[PDB]
Design a protein around this ligand. Structure first.
Ligand code: EAJ
Ligand code: CL
Length: 242
């Protein structure tokens, strides 16, 4: 069942923005969103693709574990945190595209395509360059499809090993305190219009889990912090977090 709550639009408009938040109550199997249409519109996944990419790299042995060091290639890039060595944990934390581009090359087109189909991930279309298709190729995924994929990951139901799924969920760890745990991944899509920011993941409570997926218009990098800020305002309004 699905319910549309347009009152959340206030959280976007008060920030002169537009977007969608989708929430899923796992216990009650009920979904909530401010915009049913946009919840089902398909966008480039951008760095949210690091979730499936990590799973595939681990399950194929391209990545041994979360400690393996991927050495900086020595090319100075405009994002300072990328000009350093990384492991899976820090590569996720800092959305280190060049590390995941190498993952994709080693995975290869054939295995990547098969695995995304097994994951039922978005439109499952890797058309484009194997090392950038999630940034400017043909792959697309909606906010509701992100939730479906994330629910499988949470339950270890994706068609990779349990170990691979546990490692990626560890690497998704974003926030934890005495009230909740958030495992999530941000995304920032600029190469194909409309430019958007993503935040997808879930909130673990003592007795329930709330999956979430949001995207919003992102004409400049100035508003990136609104991805988390708007989501949490919705979570607070729905009394999911204090
Ligand atoms: C394509 O990443 C960027 C492009 C332009 C400006 C900043 C970034 C950036 C770099 C790393 C993480 C994030 C982020 O999702 O918060 C954003
Ligand atoms: Cl953990």
């Amino acid at each position: 069942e699905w319910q549309e709550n347009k009152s959340w639009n206030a959280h976007f408009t008060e920030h002169k923005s537009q977007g969608v938040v989708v929430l899923w109550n796992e216990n009650k199997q009920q979904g909530f969103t401010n915009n049913l249409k946009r919840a089902n519109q398909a966008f480039l996944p951008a760095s949210t693709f690091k979730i499936p990419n990590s799973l595939i790299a681990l399950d194929l042995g391209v990545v041994k574990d979360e400690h393996q060091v991927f050495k900086w290639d020595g090319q100075t890039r405009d994002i300072a945190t990328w000009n350093r060595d990384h492991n899976l944990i820090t590569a996720m934390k800092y959305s280190v595209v060049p590390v995941y581009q190498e993952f994709a090359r080693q995975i290869g087109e054939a295995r990547m395509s098969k695995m995304l189909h097994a994951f039922d991930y978005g439109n499952e279309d890797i058309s484009g360059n194997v090392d950038s298709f999630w940034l400017d190729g043909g792959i697309r995924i909606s906010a509701t499809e992100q939730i479906s994929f994330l629910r499988k990951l949470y339950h270890n139901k994706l068609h990779v090993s349990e170990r691979s799924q546990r490692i990626v969920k560890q690497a998704m760890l974003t926030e934890a305190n005495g009230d909740y745990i958030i495992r999530a991944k941000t995304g920032y899509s600029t190469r194909i219009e409309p430019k958007i920011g993503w935040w997808v993941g879930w909130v673990e409570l003592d007795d329930n889990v709330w999956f979430f997926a949001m995207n919003m218009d992102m004409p400049t990098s100035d508003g990136l912090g609104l991805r988390q800020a708007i989501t949490k305002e919705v979570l607070k309004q729905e009394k999911i977090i204090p």
